[PDB]
Amino acid sequence: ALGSMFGCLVAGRLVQTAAQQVAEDKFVFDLPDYESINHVVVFMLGTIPFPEGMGGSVYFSYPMPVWQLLGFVTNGKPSAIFKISHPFSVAQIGISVELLDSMAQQTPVGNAAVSSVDSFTQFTQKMLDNFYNFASSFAVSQAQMTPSPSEMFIPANVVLKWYENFQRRLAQNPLFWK
Amino acid sequence: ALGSMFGCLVAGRLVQTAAQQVAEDKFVFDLPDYESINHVVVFMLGTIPFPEGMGGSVYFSYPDPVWQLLGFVTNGKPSAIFKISGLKSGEGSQHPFGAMNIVRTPSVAQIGISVELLDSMAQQTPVGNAAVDSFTQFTQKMLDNFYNFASSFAVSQAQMTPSPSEMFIPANVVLKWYENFQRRLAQNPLFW
């Protein structure tokens, strides 16, 4: 035939290349022992390119099976690493051949260091929620303040300002902190 | 002897399978444009297993002939991902690569694989931060970052500007929160 197009590698195991064809432009790798899957590496073998105007969207499913879009591979960027621990015990990697123009409009959650980029925002939101739920009881206005020229106060709006700064820095680079 | 036995992958690039064989048990991959690399993937091709009692030690060379040990690959664990950025120089075991002609430059790094006795590999020490907990670093940094930021706005009553619509939190309350959250994060990193 033409041969295999993709490799799928669970860190700690061997490369899988014999993907199961589930559609003319969709391919799936079954991954056993989902619990021991920390990282997956998905890549082009270099034998067959994506067709004109096309790239690959990489999805992951895990235990009922639930899917998430990890990211993309293209002729220009033919490999990607994803931390692990719609078009489609045992997990699956799915690759769907799609228009490059369409792939640009999607929002992948995958990342090489963290399972989901949403966890960054999720943690920050819960940290600030924990702070304000605690601090709110003690908040005072200047009119409510009792005379104490020496005591230090922090404006409540630092919550909002820091969150806004975090969002901006995260949008630039999801791993700015690392 | 073992032929092309290993593969090497940098994220965003094509897999390399053709290593320089500086000995019949020693394989070297060139990595051009090294400063734009954080992670490297090394793996057995699955063409042939390691011989009985043998495994692979994976080394890295960079600009300051000299290799830091990154880690290992074996028949039982035939692939691994390594961090090669931010490694502290001078650490870890020494290297077996005595090829006269390992042609080298500051922009071109190497990954070296030596087929070694498993017994010998068990006595080697990889450098720190090589093996790949990342989210733990994130949460700690964000906590410290937020507290330092919030604290930078701390003001006494005498230093305040009139702002009748603004609310203020006593600084000792913010500090108490910071200490408690730090402490609860270190016993249950997923408490939140």
Swiss-Prot record, chain B:
Pfam families linked: Hikeshi-like_C, Hikeshi-like_N
Query: Listed GO cellular component terms?
Result: cytosol; nuclear body; nuclear speck; nucleoplasm; nucleus
Q: Per the entry, what induces it? A: Following heat-shock treatment.
Q: Which Gene Ontology terms cover its molecular function?
A: Hsp70 protein binding; nuclear import signal receptor activity
Subcellular location(s): the record lists:
Cytoplasm; Cytoplasm, Cytosol; Nucleus
Residues annotated as region Required for F-X-F-G repeats-nucleoporins recognition and nuclear import? 22-59
Function as written in the Swiss-Prot or TrEMBL entry: Acts as a specific nuclear import carrier for HSP70 proteins following heat-shock stress: acts by mediating the nucleoporin-dependent translocation of ATP-bound HSP70 proteins into the nucleus. HSP70 proteins import is required to protect cells from heat shock damages. Does not translocate ADP-bound HSP70 proteins into the nucleus.
Q: Subunit composition?
A: Forms an asymmetric homodimer; required for binding and nuclear import of HSP70 proteins. Interacts with ATP-bound HSP70 proteins. Interacts with NUP62 and NUP153 (via F-X-F-G repeats). Interacts with HSPA8.
The record makes one more remark, namely: 'Hikeshi' is a traditional Japanese compound word used for a firefighter, smokejumper, or troubleshooter.
Instruction: Name the chain's protein.
Output: Protein Hikeshi
According to its UniProt entry, this protein's organism is Homo sapiens
